[PDB]
């Protein structure tokens, strides 16, 4: 038993709620919050900008040191950094951004990173400003992640659409 509240169960291991991941993180303080990162860990907008803002830019400062030491991530890849005031850890995961022209097949590889963590609070990868179909992102999540994932979907109308179309 964990501390997540009001999630709709979708599968054995996937749960979903209409909420801002930032607000869910501040309330729950999960072991792992997933960031919808880019390969440069430049946290400007959407999930990344919102989480980073909630850390008072400490996420960005830590990220810049990570990139200076290690270079960029791969599309489909991830790294574990601090969760700052929001979580114990932040798993920065790079889903493909089709608005930038990347391969959607890499979305499954991106979700595979979640399997290295027993429980995660996460957003819908490659959706929103990343340009991919959200119904598809949810399907890939359910068909790829085997650990316990609590999905926060910020957009009320998107949430309604995802629940009503879920197979
Ligand atoms: O951007 C997010 O996810 C992608 C799908 N979208 C687009 C806008 O609304 C959505 O749900 C998202 N999710 C959960 N918490 C969030 N806090 C800020 C952004 C955000």
Swiss-Prot record:
Task of the protein: Responsible for the cleavages located at the N-terminus of the replicase polyprotein. Participates together with nsp4 in the assembly of virally-induced cytoplasmic double-membrane vesicles necessary for viral replication. Antagonizes innate immune induction of type I interferon by blocking the phosphorylation, dimerization and subsequent nuclear translocation of host IRF3. Also prevents host NF-kappa-B signaling. In addition, PL-PRO possesses a deubiquitinating/deISGylating activity and processes both 'Lys-48'- and 'Lys-63'-linked polyubiquitin chains from cellular substrates.
Name of the protein in its database record: Papain-like protease nsp3
Superkingdom, natural source: Viruses
Outcome after substituting residue 31 to A: In strain: Mu/B.1.621
Domain Macro as annotated: residue spans: 1-167
Subunit structure: May form homohexamers. Interacts with N protein.
Regulation: Inhibited in vitro by GRL-0617.
Places the protein is found: Host endoplasmic reticulum membrane
Membrane topology: Multi-pass membrane protein
Reactions that this protein is recorded to catalyse: Thiol-dependent hydrolysis of ester, thioester, amide, peptide and isopeptide bonds formed by the C-terminal Gly of ubiquitin (a 76-residue protein attached to proteins as an intracellular targeting signal)
Mutation effect (residue 164 to L): In strain: Gamma/P.1
């Amino acid at each position: 038993v964990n501390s997540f509240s009001g999630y709709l169960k979708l599968t054995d291991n996937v749960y979903i709620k209409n909420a801002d991941i930032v607000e869910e993180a501040k309330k729950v303080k999960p072991t792992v919050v997933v960031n919808a990162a880019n390969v440069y860990l430049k946290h400007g907008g959407g999930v990344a900008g919102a989480l980073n803002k909630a850390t008072n830019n400490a996420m960005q400062v830590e990220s810049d040191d990570y990139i200076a030491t290690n270079g960029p991530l791969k599309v489909g890849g991830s790294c574990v950094l601090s969760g700052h005031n929001l979580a114990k850890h932040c798993l920065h995961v790079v889903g493909p951004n089709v608005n930038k022209g990347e391969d959607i097949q890499l979305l499954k590889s991106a979700y595979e990173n979640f399997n290295q963590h027993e429980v995660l609070l996460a957003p819908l990868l490659s959706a929103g400003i990343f340009g991919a179909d959200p119904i598809h992102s949810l399907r890939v999540c359910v068909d790829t992640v085997r650990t316990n994932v609590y999905l926060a979907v910020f957009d009320k109308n998107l949430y309604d659409k995802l629940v009503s179309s879920f197979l």
